[PDB]
Symmetry: C2
Subunit: 246 residues, 2 copies
């Protein structure tokens, strides 16, 4: 399984800043045929980033519409993402599940639009603090996954990401092994709703806080196939994280 | 005062369709100092459009984040737009109030955010079929207007837009004379809480269905200063609409 290393710049950046960060990322010489590296900039920051990052790097956008083209002010569609050659899309990131009310229903509609236009989706999920304290993890992750897992046609064009929300700001932090458990559990869920084969080929990323100190300790985990890094990806040392996957 | 005319492409357009159109747009010789003509392409189309369209044409985005920069996957913060030199932004467009639960609170917030970053806004609002149908347009409009209007300090950088939602859809169509009324009321509300000066200098575009055949009928109205043209702006004929205002 090809390790997956994604950079989620979220809503951050300035022309000059990306210039620096990208020029930095370029220095690391990696073989994309062995490893996948994806940086997701800000909608309006896309064309800037793409023309700065050497092709070895892959790029997507942090979001896609649930509708096709038409009267949907403020929305970018998979239709457009395609004609613009954007290769990946993040869907269901908890930050949009929270501040914007996106739902499983929406994530399904979004996953479907993307695959129909040949986009590659990086779909996210993960139980909450309260949900975990109710020993309802496996349960939630199943309801979540089973909400779109049926739409995947080619298990190399859809990337799963686990977001341990139960830690998102509480001093807490999933141990490289605690994450590992949920992971292997996600995959099982995949096995029994798609087939032993499928699950052994779909990549499942970690979503918790990632960085230089734990990256290698994480990727090394049995069922963690890389990660969707947040703030650590806005610093030039991010190259160190990519390495841990080389 | 200065007539304002904008093209709201919404979620429509490919790299080529835009190349071609924009060109059909350049041909029209108008003074950008006597009239305002603004185009709003899809986020991942701003750069492409901006470069292809000439200076006489102002360009902007269709939505701006209510939050500043930070962990907000999927959003575009006003500051990022300021660093990008995006001059205009649309806010509270009914489609975003509907499909996405944007509120009067949000609008208020995004406007205050846009202005902090020297952006120029085109804020939208209007009542529903049920609301007009129960005689309340003036009650609604005032609320929606009193909701954010006070933030305005330079009555040239914020442009109000009315949207006859009660028609939009209902196979109906507000008449020029009707639109005019609502417009004089909006103006008044601007006056009542900002002063005659502010009031008589702010522009209030139409926002209902505008086309090569009724633009005249509306612009002519004395409380109509231009419009937020939809589908028609995807055609080369849009120019004739700019013309109705020059």
């Amino acid at each position: 399984r090809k390790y997956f290393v994604a950079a989620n710049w979220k809503c951050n950046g300035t022309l000059e800043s990306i210039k620096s960060l990208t020029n930095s990322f370029n220095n690391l010489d990696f073989d994309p045929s062995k490893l996948d590296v994806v940086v997701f900039p800000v909608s309006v920051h896309y064309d800037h980033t793409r023309k700065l990052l050497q092709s070895k790097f892959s790029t997507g956008i942090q979001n896609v519409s649930k509708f096709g083209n038409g009267s949907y002010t403020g929305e970018v569609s998979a239709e457009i993402a395609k004609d613009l050659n954007i290769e990946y899309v993040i869907i269901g990131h908890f930050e949009r599940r929270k501040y914007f009310h996106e739902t499983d229903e929406d994530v399904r509609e979004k996953l479907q639009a993307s695959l129909k236009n040949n986009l590659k989706a990086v779909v996210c999920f993960g139980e909450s603090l309260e949900q975990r304290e109710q020993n309802k993890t496996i349960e939630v992750i199943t309801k979540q996954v089973k909400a779109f897992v049926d739409l995947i046609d080619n298990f190399d064009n859809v990337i799963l990401v686990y977001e341990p929300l139960w830690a998102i700001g509480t001093g807490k932090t999933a141990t490289p092994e605690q994450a590992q458990l949920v992971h292997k559990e996600i995959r099982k869920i995949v096995k029994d709703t798609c087939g032993e084969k499928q699950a052994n080929q779909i990549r499942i990323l970690y979503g918790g806080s990632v960085n230089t100190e734990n990256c290698s300790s994480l990727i090394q985990q049995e069922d963690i196939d890389g990660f969707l890094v947040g703030n650590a990806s806005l610093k030039e040392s991010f190259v160190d994280i990519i390495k841990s996957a080389m």
